[PDB]
Every structure is written in C-alpha cells, then in structure tokens.
C-alpha cells in the first residue's frame, strides 16, 4: 500500500458523431476581429 | 506575460494558461475554448420516435 | 563511526536524529547531562564517537 | 478537563504550602485575584519565547475571572504552576529551594520538547536542478523555486 | 481524474470555485500458497516405484485447476453489474447481445470484452443458431459440429466447464434500508465498497445473505459515466445493482448488516464523481435478485481491465 | 496526467450543449415520444418525410442510442435471403451504413429532456402575425394560449 | 496481582515517614487526595517526554478514586512512587536526602532502559542498488524506496 | 484591558512587599508619585537602548498622573515592572534576591527577543552584475546600487 | 556537518538561522546556557558540530 505504479487505470469515454455530421464548412473562419460577434448569410 | 500552450483534440484547439496568482504556493491552470453556432433553416430537422 | 549519547540526553528527540541525512535541518537539538541533584555537569555535545 | 485559572493558582499556592485545604489560615480573595492576573500577564508574555500553546484570553475587556476555563491541556499544568510559583514567591517574602528549582526546570523542559520547530532550511533558488530530473518547457522547473516574489504590473518598483 | 467545467460569457472566473485534485488508489493483495507434496520410502523407490514421472505428471494440472477455481470465485464475488434473472436460462440471441450493449452504453472503451458460459448454454445457443434462414455455412456448422462463432452478438463468447457454483441463501420479507449510508467520494474512494443495514427480513435466519448475491435498488438509476446522463432500456430505466461480499445473519427485529461492492457515489461538494441518479435515502426499496435457495452455475461477462492475475516467482532454497 | 481527461471534458460539454441546441431549434416531429424504436418503418419514416418535404441539395442523417440499435440488429437477424446481412447481424450485431434510405448512427452521448407539467384543453386566443416581413429574419414567433392550469411554474419546458 | 492507585500514594508517604505503618502516625484525606491528583497530573505530563507505560486515566468529568486500577505493570511501581514523592515533598516544607535521590535516579534509569528504542537510519532513497541484486527481473527496483 | 501607570507602579511595590494585600500594609501617597515619575524618567531613558516600545509621554508642562493611560502593550508589563523594581529598591535600601534578579533577567530577555533587527548587510556598489541577469546596456544597471 | 544547540538556547530565534545562506546577515543571535538557578555556565557558541 506504499509503492504506486506509473500507469493510470483506464476510464470511460463518450463518442463524437454530432460534430462530425453537422455542417463545419459554411461557418469557418468568418468570425474574425473585423466582422464582430455575429455574421449572417443570405436566403433563397 | 503568462505561460501558455495549445492542445489539439479531434480538430478542436484548446488554449491552456498557467499562473501562480497569490503567494499561497498554489499553482493554477485554465483551459479555454469558444464556440459559434448557426441554425440555417428550422424546417430541415427535428426529433423522431416510434409509433404504435 | 557512530555517536554515543545518553538515554535521558536524547529521549524524545530520536525522530530528528533518524533523518539528519535526508532532510536539511538548520540545527540538531540535544539536552545536557545532569546528576541526581539537577546540576549541569557537561555540555550538550555527544560524549564521543566510536573508533 | 476544565483546568480553571483559579485551580492553577491554588495549585501554585499548595505546592509551596502558602495555603492548602488542611490549613487553619487561608488567603483572602484579592490574593487569588492578583494571582490570576499575574497568570494572564505571564501567559500573554509567553507568546514570544515559548510561543502560543493554546491559552484562551478574555475578549471584550472583562476583568479576569478565576472560574473561567483556561483552555490548556492537562499536560501543561505543572509547568505553568511552577513558573507561576517562581514569579509569585517574592510577594509572600519567601525564597525558592533546590528541589523546587529542579522540578520547575524538568517540567519546563518537558513542555519545551512538545513544541519543536526544526525549520529545515530550503534550497537557494538559483541552484540548478540536474539534467536527470527531466525538466520540461511548460512547467519550467529547470531551477529550484525560491522566495518567488509576486510582482504586479502596477507598483513596478515595489 | 475527473473534472467539471464553467460557463461564462467573457471568461471572468475570479469569483467562482476551481476543481481540486482528489486522487484515489486501487489496492491488490496476494493470496495463499498452492502446494502439492508427496513422500515415499527408499525401499519403495528401490523395489516398487517405477514410471515415477508418468505417476507424478498431473500435479501441475491440479495446481492450475486450483488456481483457476480460486480466480473464478474471486471474479464472481467481486463483480458488480447484473443482467437478467437466474430463474431463466440462456436461450436466445438477445440474451447474449445485451451484455455487449450494456457495456458499450456504460462507457467502456479500452480493451476487449468477454463473456463466459457453460456447455449447456453453448448447446442451446447452437440450437438457436440452427434456425437461421440465409447463412448456409453457419447453419451447416451449427447442425454438424454444434459450435458457435468466436464473435457472438458483438462480444467474444467462450465456453468453459471450469466454472464454480454458488448458492442463494434463504431470504424473505419486504427489505428496505433503515439508516442512510455514507456515499461521499472522499470516504468511499479507497475500495469501492460500503456497508448498509436493512429492515423487514425474517425474524432469525442464519446465512440470510450469502456471498455473490445481488441486490438491486428500485428507485435509483445508473448513470452514463462521462456524460452524466441517465440510462434507459427503451422505456424502463436501468436500476443500480450491487453484490454481497461475505455471509450475513439476521437478528431479532429483521435487521441485517451487509457489505456491498460497487457504490452509488452521489457527492454534493464534488459532483464531478457522480455515478448514480439520486442519493439512497432511508426507506428506499431494495430487492434481491434470484430465488430463496436456488443453486446454479452463473455465467459471467467482463472487460479486459476488470480483474488482474499474477504468478509471483519463488526463490530457491539453500 | 491532467492533459488527457480535460480535453475529453471540453469536447463532451461542447457536444452535449450542441445536442441541446439542435433539439431546441429543430421543428419537425414524428411519432409518439412514449414509444421507443423497434422496427424498420420507425427509421424509414424520417427519410420518407424529408423526401416528401422536397429537400434535395444536402445529405440526410439520423442518430439512435445503443439499446435501440440492438433491437434493429435483432430484427435484421430474422431476414430471409440476405446471407451477408444475416451473417453480419448475427456475428457483429452491426446494421449497415445506409438503413432505410438514411444514414443511421449509434451514439451513447445524448442529452435527455423532461416534458414539464401541463393540463387542460389548450387553444389560441389571439391571432399571431406570421407575415414574411415579420418572420424573414429568424423563423420564430410569439403566440398566446388559453385553457391551461390555474398557476403552475414551468408550464412548458424547452424542447 | 493488580496494582491500583492510592497504594502508590501510601508508598510515597511511607518511604519518607510522613505517615508510616510503624511511626505512630496517621494518614489524612487531604494528603490522600493531593497525592492522587498529583499522580494523575504527573502521568498526564509523562505521556510526552518518557514513553507511555499504560496508565489508565479516569473517565471524563469524574474524580479519580484511590480504588481505581492504575493499570501499570508491577515493575514501574518503585519509579512512579519515587518520582511522585520527589514532586510532592515540597508541600510539607521538607527536603529530600542523597540516598533517596540516588534510589530515585537508579529506579528512573531502570524504567528508561525498558522503554528505550533505537531507530535505524534508513537509506536516502536515490541511492543506487548494485547489479548483484538482479534488479532487471523486477520493474521499479533500480533504486532504494526510501521511507514512507 | 489597557495599562495604567498606577497599575504598573503598584505591581512593582507589591512584588517586593513594600506595600501589598498579603502584608497588611497600604500604599502611602508619597511612594506612588515617586513610582510614577521614576517610571516616566526610566521610559525617557529607555527611548534609546531597548528602542521605542509604544510609551505615551506627558504633554509638556503637565505632570504625569497615575490615572493616565500609559499605552504600553500588555506583554511588556512584567519587564517594565521588574526594571522599575530594580531601579526602585535603593529608595528603601532593600537588597534584591537572586530569584528577583533571575526573573528580571528573564523578562528583559523575553522583551528583547521581540525587537531584533538583523540588518542583513547589503551589496557593495561597484560589484559587477553578471551576464546571466541580461542587464540593459544603456541603463546604469551593470553594477549594484548599494546605497540608501 | 550540522551544529548542535540546546533547545532554550535557540528557541524564538530560528528564522534567522534558517535563512543564513540566502540572505546576508551582519551577525547571528544566540543565547547562553543557564542552569536551574539562572547562572551562566557556558558561552553563546553552539555546543558542538556533527562529525
């Protein structure tokens, strides 16, 4: 109960599917120091 | 004037800062990430369940 | 070499002497030698060292 | 248990036989009052050389009360009473004896051995740490920490 | 370690609290020696003892068998999860697939999962497989050799006859907790076990609860460990379950004290380590899964990093 | 040691609040919330509705929990002629990529919502303004309803 | 045979003829109470500087009584009695004698030599262990563990 | 709990029994004024060697009175009283006892322990500053200041 | 090497001895050795040093 190994026990993890499926293309690097805190797109 | 670094995880970049505010001999670290979200058209999604 | 002390001289202070080579104390405490009447007859130094 | 100041004063009187339970003549209340007063002055002064030992003081500028709880452990009463006796003997025009002095010294040493310090002085701060400690870029630790002043952007000189 | 986050529109966290580093340790201990010793006379060796090597061959097999039996006992005593009821044997495909689904939903990621079942259950699974409609190779294999594939229901299934058997032990009455236990992480972070007393048992029964019994808490639920969300098997939430460690007896008044493995951590000052929906207050309903005195061979399921086994080498004597 | 389980926390919180955002902003609904997912039509109806509305430019998707998928894998094991499908479902319990015309995904990290107490025959009392000039910027509108309970906090939750 | 309080006080009062069995003298309740209280406080302070010897303290908010068992082993009786006698002699304005001082010192040394313990200096903790110990068989035994 | 000159002087007179409740004697007015002005003069002298300790002096042309608030901290009372007794006893031509002298020395040592300075000698002024500090070349920061 | 001092010889003055290698004190304080009667028997120097 004195010496401790240098490897931690494994833990629990969730999964990522929502971020990978949602659109990460249209809004990418448009909220810069110039545009401000919000930016808008057009509608058909 | 604060020690910092960057961490990457599934394409997300997290800013880590380290400092020693106060003379309590207690170090402090903070991790930062800011997100932006938009809803293009509410009529193109939603929830769904089963029916009897 | 091992120092030589007295039982009543070092009683109650063994923990500070057991770790004088691990920690970095500013000083080492020790008592004086007193006879049956309570008078001081010797200093606080150890009596001697083994050869 | 309670270890009252009046009990300590009566102990100090008893061990020199100024006045005990098996005595035809006893001391008047103001003698006990002055004894307790001197006890508290001595204990307040004891916050320098021996250091705080857990004594409880009178808060709210009340006159000392003999029946109040001192708040000291029972392992201190002989030392406190002996040191009180040595200060109080002159008032009764009496002088200490070798046995009393030896007992007071022994009890004081017993109290002293319970409040050690061993400051265990530190390392400098510009002393290099070895290359075998595997220091890193972010956590620094290439040199031992020292006094580590907390410098603020405001107040630059101080 | 586990942590919790903060939300601030600008990042000013001057007046809020910061996560502390509470670390726990899991302990492992050695058991007892396994020794097989024989002796014989010199005259016996001279005139009678021949083929001694073939005589003494199975000692290593006996040693290994004893080790395996002890390991199985330890695993079934230390397991905490529970699925199904002992009253019904394994018959279908969902009966095995449920273990894989439960382990995935709980949040186990590293390692490989395993399930261990007895030859009769393997036979019944093969019988169920023989009713397939399109996989001719699997149908032929099951019909002829009575075998099952290595992967079965998304989990690796194995058949062994070295499993041990356990007994339930007589119990009865509407069992419920009497005193609120302590489930604070700083208290239960060393061994993942806790002690609790019940009320409503039989008047005076010896061996009321035996080792390996399982008790489920009706009105509390498991928690998805990383997302801290509740678990629902369709429309029926999954209930917290735990296993008894050693034998217990009931005294007059229906009071029994029992030590359980696996804990419902619900700590208010450190919410980051929660593993249950709600606290276990006094008067909560508990029940014991099984039958009054049923005896059976329990099937097992586990992850790679559940239990660990080692064989300490021994030094030579002078 | 701290680096490994903090990025996981960051990502988990991000995804949880993103799921909350999507379930708070989505409009379409299908089926009764009480009934879980059991059969093939329960998944096919989403793709059918999305096609019926008229959306083509884009790529459809659907997300289901672990327990629901096993129920579909079990249904797939009962097929009659697809040897590959029955083999995969029997061994790995894995549904194909394209299930019913939409891509079905399995995730265990998913937010949960409480309904919120309500009672009484509800009806609208005032005609709202849903002109395109008014709602051409947000697709949101404010409406008032009657016939509710006397006085309850949280009559309608979010979602 | 067990040893109780009160008999220690009687021993102290007898070895210097304050109240002896054959001295045509008598004991007094005041003397008994003072001796009992002195013994209690003296053991309380002995708890720290000399080693603990197993004395049985009175329960909270209850006065000590002479009939209560002390719990000390019978060997420590002479040392305890002599120390108590030296600590209470000054109450009667009396002074001890060299023979009593020598006896008390000898008995105290006899008590000390029983509770004496000598700690062993542990190795530093970064001291290498040689190749003759075959540390390669084990994982993290390349150096000495130190102390807890 | 503030101190007073009358209280401090009375403590000194009681300590050698010149005037005390234990004896049946009572304070004579002449002894008290002598104590007060002797205390004031002794503090005025003390303003150098022990250093300032917080005494409150009497505003010019006004004599000190026993009811005036001294302003001294409570812990210095024993030290001040014993020094006053030592410089007082010559008035009645008494002789201090060894115990009184030892108590006075102990109190003086305890008072002096709280006033140590250890000035911690500074650098020279022409001592070079190394290249590890990365000094600024234009500024006069290649050497230590070493002054006020 | 470590110095050896009495307990009452250095009680109350430990902070100046602890930081004697970092700061630059002009001197160091220490008390004398006093018997039970208050008389001086030894100087203000430490009793001895460890070998």
Dump strand ranges (E) for chain G: none
Alpha helices in B1-52 (DSSP H): none
What are the phi and psi torsion angles at H4 (to 5°)? -135, 150
User: b vs e for H106-124, b when ≥16 Cβ sit within 10 Å of the residue's Cβ?
Assistant: bbbbbbeeeeeebeeeeee
Hey, is the C-beta of G1 within 8 angstroms of any chain A C-beta? no
Measure in Å the smallest separation between the Cα of E166 and chain B Cα atoms: 42
Could you count the other beta carbons within 10 Å of the beta carbon of residue E144? Answer: 9
Q: In units of Å, what resolution does this entry have?
A: 3.7
- Closest residue, chain H, to I38 (C-alpha): H102
Three-state SS at A44 = coil
Contact E206, E170 (CB under 8 A): no
Contact assignment for D41 to H77 by CB distance below 8 Å: yes
> What does the alpha-carbon distance between residue E257 and residue E248 come to, in Å, rounded to a whole number?
7
Smallest Cβ–Cβ distance between D105 and the set C26, C29, C38 belongs to C38
Hey, is the C-beta of H130 within 8 angstroms of any chain I C-beta? no
DSSP E52-74: HHHHHTTHHHHHHHHHHHHHHHH
Q: How far apart, in Å, are the Cα atoms of B2 and each of D151, E8, I47? A: 13, 21, 50
* A-chain residues near E305 (CB < 8 A): 9-10
> What does the alpha-carbon distance between residue E103 and residue E82 come to, in Å, rounded to a whole number?
11
* C-chain residues near G124 (CB < 8 A): 21-22
What kind and span of H or E run contains E232?
Answer: strand E232-233
Q: Which chains touch G (3 or more CB pairs under 8 A)?
A: A, C, D
Smallest Cβ–Cβ distance between I29 and the set H105, H116, H122 belongs to H116
Angle (CA) A28 A30 A36, round 5°: 140
* G-chain residues near A3 (CB < 8 A): 140, 145
* A-chain residues near F107 (CB < 8 A): 15, 17-18
Contact G130, G66 (CB under 8 A): no
Residue D60 annotated as binding site: yes
Q: Which letter does DSSP use for residue G4 in this model?
A: B
In a domain, D26, yes or no: yes
Sequence-distant (6+) residues with CB within 8 A of E5 are F9, F10, F13
> What does the alpha-carbon distance between residue H64 and residue H80 come to, in Å, rounded to a whole number?
17
Find how far residue E106's CA is from the centre of its chain: 15
> What does the alpha-carbon distance between residue I11 and residue D115 come to, in Å, rounded to a whole number?
10
> What does the alpha-carbon distance between residue H108 and residue C34 come to, in Å, rounded to a whole number?
27
Sequence-distant (6+) residues with CB within 8 A of F121 are F147
Domain count, chain H: 1
Find how far residue D118's CA is from the centre of its chain: 17
Contact assignment for E13 to B32 by CB distance below 8 Å: no
β-partners of residue B30 are: B17
Alpha helices in chain E (DSSP H): 42-47, 52-56, 59-78, 94-106, 119-129, 136-145, 185-188
Contact assignment for G45 to D15 by CB distance below 8 Å: no
Residue pointed to by tokens 């359980």: E260
Phi-psi region for residue B10, left (φ > 0), alpha (ψ -120 to 50) or beta? left
Strand E214-221 relative to strand E239-244: parallel, antiparallel, unpaired?
Answer: antiparallel
Contact assignment for B22 to D150 by CB distance below 8 Å: yes
Longest CA pairwise span in chain H (Å):
82
Q: Environment class of residue F141 by beta-carbon count within 10 Å: exposed (0-12), middle (13-18) or buried (19+)? A: exposed
What kind and span of H or E run contains H136?
Answer: none
Smallest Cβ–Cβ distance between H120 and the set I13, I26, I38 belongs to I26
Dump strand ranges (E) for A1-44: none
Hey, is the C-beta of I4 within 8 angstroms of any chain C C-beta? yes
- Closest residue, chain D, to B17 (C-alpha): D138
> What does the alpha-carbon distance between residue F110 and residue A14 come to, in Å, rounded to a whole number?
9
β-partners of residue I49 are: I3
Domain that holds residue H33: 1-148
User: b vs e for E159-171, b when ≥16 Cβ sit within 10 Å of the residue's Cβ?
Assistant: beeebeebebbeb
Residues in B whose CB is inside 8 Å of some CB of D read 1, 3, 5, 18, 20-23
Smallest Cβ–Cβ distance between C44 and the set I4, I14, I36 belongs to I4
User: b vs e for D106-125, b when ≥16 Cβ sit within 10 Å of the residue's Cβ?
Assistant: bbbbbbbbbeebbeebbeee
Written as six digits, the tokens of H99 are 């115990």
Nearest to E185 by CA among E81, E279, E78, E271: E271
* B-chain residues near A27 (CB < 8 A): 36, 38
Strand F61-64 relative to strand E300-302: parallel, antiparallel, unpaired?
Answer: unpaired
Residue G1 annotated as binding site: yes
Could you count the other beta carbons within 10 Å of the beta carbon of residue D35? Answer: 25
Q: Which chains touch C (3 or more CB pairs under 8 A)?
A: D, G, I
Three-state SS at F99 = strand
Q: Environment class of residue E257 by beta-carbon count within 10 Å: exposed (0-12), middle (13-18) or buried (19+)? A: middle
Top residue of D47, D82, D109, D119 to mutate, by most chain I CBs within 10 Å, is D119
Handedness of CA E117, E123, E128, E131 (dihedral sign): positive
* A-chain residues near E227 (CB < 8 A): 14
Hey, is the C-beta of C37 within 8 angstroms of any chain G C-beta? yes
Q: Environment class of residue G76 by beta-carbon count within 10 Å: exposed (0-12), middle (13-18) or buried (19+)? A: buried
Q: How far apart, in Å, are the Cα atoms of E108 and each of A11, A12, E303, G13? A: 7, 5, 8, 77
Hey, is the C-beta of E46 within 8 angstroms of any chain F C-beta? no
Hey, is the C-beta of H131 within 8 angstroms of any chain D C-beta? no
- Closest residue, chain F, to A9 (C-alpha): F1
Contact assignment for A18 to F5 by CB distance below 8 Å: no
Contact assignment for D96 to H100 by CB distance below 8 Å: no
> What does the alpha-carbon distance between residue E66 and residue E62 come to, in Å, rounded to a whole number?
6
β-partners of residue E209 are: E248
Top residue of G95, G105, G109, G117 to mutate, by most chain C CBs within 10 Å, is G105
What kind and span of H or E run contains G48?
Answer: none
Contact F77, E92 (CB under 8 A): no
> What does the alpha-carbon distance between residue H24 and residue H32 come to, in Å, rounded to a whole number?
17
Three-state SS at G132 = helix
Q: Environment class of residue F71 by beta-carbon count within 10 Å: exposed (0-12), middle (13-18) or buried (19+)? A: buried
Angle (CA) F18 F19 F24, round 5°: 95
Written as six digits, the tokens of E134 are 């399109």
* I-chain residues near H104 (CB < 8 A): none
Contact assignment for H17 to D90 by CB distance below 8 Å: yes
> What does the alpha-carbon distance between residue E140 and residue B42 come to, in Å, rounded to a whole number?
53
Nearest to D80 by CA among D102, D49, D47, D111: D111
Written as six digits, the tokens of E256 are 């029994």
Helical packing angle, D29-45 and D5-14, nearest 10°? 100
Contact F124, F104 (CB under 8 A): no
Written as six digits, the tokens of E289 are 């899964």
Could you count the other beta carbons within 10 Å of the beta carbon of residue E135? Answer: 23
Q: How was this structure determined?
A: cryo-EM
* F-chain residues near E109 (CB < 8 A): none
CA contacts within 13 A on the Cβ side of I5: 23
Measure in Å the smallest separation between the Cα of B15 and chain F Cα atoms: 11
What kind and span of H or E run contains G82?
Answer: helix G77-88
> What does the alpha-carbon distance between residue E17 and residue E8 come to, in Å, rounded to a whole number?
13
Nearest to G72 by CA among G50, G91, G89: G50
Smallest Cβ–Cβ distance between D138 and the set B18, B20, B21 belongs to B18
Residue D71 annotated as binding site: yes
Contact assignment for F15 to A13 by CB distance below 8 Å: no
């Amino acid at each position: 109960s004195q010496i401790v190994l240098k490897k931690f026990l494994p833990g629990f993890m969730s999964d990522l599917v929502l971020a990978k499926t949602v659109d990460r293309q249209l809004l990418a690097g448009e909220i810069n120091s110039s545009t401000g805190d919000s930016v808008s797109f057009k509608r058909p | 004037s604060i020690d910092s670094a960057v961490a990457t995880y599934e394409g997300f970049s997290i800013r880590v800062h380290k400092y020693a505010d106060g003379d309590a001999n207690v170090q402090k670290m903070r991790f930062d990430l800011l997100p932006a979200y938009v809803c293009f058209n509410p009529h193109m999604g939603g929830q769904f369940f089963g029916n009897p | 070499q091992i120092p030589i002390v007295g039982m009543e001289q070092i009683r109650g202070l063994e923990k500070h002497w057991e770790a004088r080579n691990k920690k970095r104390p500013a000083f080492l405490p020790l008592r004086e030698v007193r006879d049956k009447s309570g008078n001081i007859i010797a200093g606080a130094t150890p009596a001697g060292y083994t050869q | 248990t309670v270890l009252t100041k009046g009990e300590i004063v009566l102990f100090a009187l008893r061990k020199f036989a100024i006045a005990s339970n098996a005595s035809l003549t006893d001391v008047e209340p103001q003698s006990i009052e002055d004894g307790v007063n001197d006890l508290e002055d001595m204990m307040s002064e004891w916050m320098i050389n021996p250091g705080d030992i857990g004594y409880a003081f009178a808060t709210g500028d009340e006159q000392p009360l003999p029946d109040d709880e001192s708040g000291l452990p029972r392992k201190y009463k002989h030392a406190v009473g002996y040191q009180l006796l040595l200060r109080m003997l002159s008032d009764y025009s009496l002088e200490p004896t070798p046995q009393v002095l030896s007992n007071a010294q022994r009890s004081y040493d017993a109290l002293m051995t319970d409040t050690l310090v061993v400051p265990s002085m530190r390392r400098r701060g510009d002393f290099p740490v070895g290359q075998g400690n595997k220091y890193d870029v972010f956590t620094s630790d290439r040199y031992y920490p020292g006094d580590l002043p907390l410098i603020d952007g405001d107040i630059p000189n101080a | 370690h586990q942590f919790s986050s903060l939300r601030t529109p600008t990042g000013d966290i001057s007046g809020q609290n910061k996560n502390n580093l509470i670390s726990g340790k899991a302990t492992g201990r050695v058991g007892n020696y396994i020794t097989v010793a024989v002796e014989y006379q010199q005259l016996e060796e001279a005139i009678k003892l021949n083929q001694l090597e073939e005589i003494l061959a199975p000692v290593r097999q006996r040693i290994v068998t004893d080790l395996e039996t002890e390991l199985a006992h330890f695993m079934m005593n230390n397991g905490a999860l529970s699925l199904g009821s002992p009253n019904t044997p394994i018959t279908k495909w969902s009966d095995v697939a449920q273990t894989a689904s439960f382990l995935k939903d709980l949040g186990v990621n590293e390692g490989e999962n395993y399930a261990v079942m007895d030859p009769w259950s393997a036979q019944r699974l093969a019988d169920a497989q023989t009713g397939l409609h399109a996989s001719d190779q699997l149908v032929r294999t099951a019909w002829e050799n009575a075998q099952i594939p290595t992967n079965f229901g998304g989990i690796r299934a194995l058949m062994s006859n070295g499993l041990a058997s356990r007994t339930q032990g007589a119990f009865g009455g509407t069992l419920t907790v009497k005193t609120q236990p302590t489930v604070t992480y700083n208290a239960v972070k060393d061994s993942y076990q806790f002690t609790v007393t019940l009320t409503g048992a039989t008047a005076s029964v010896t061996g009321f609860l035996k080792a390996g019994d399982q008790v489920k808490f009706t009105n509390t639920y498991w928690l998805q460990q990383q997302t801290k969300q509740a678990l629902y098997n369709g429309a029926t939430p999954i209930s917290f379950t735990a296993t008894v460690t050693a034998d217990a007896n009931s005294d007059s008044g229906g009071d029994v004290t029992v030590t359980l493995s696996g804990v419902p951590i619900y700590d208010t000052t450190n919410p980051q380590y929660n593993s249950v929906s709600r606290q276990v207050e006094a008067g909560d309903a508990v029940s014991v899964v099984g039958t009054a005195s049923q005896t059976m061979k329990p099937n097992l399921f586990y992850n790679k990093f559940f239990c660990g086994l080692g064989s300490i080498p021994l030094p030579k004597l002078h």
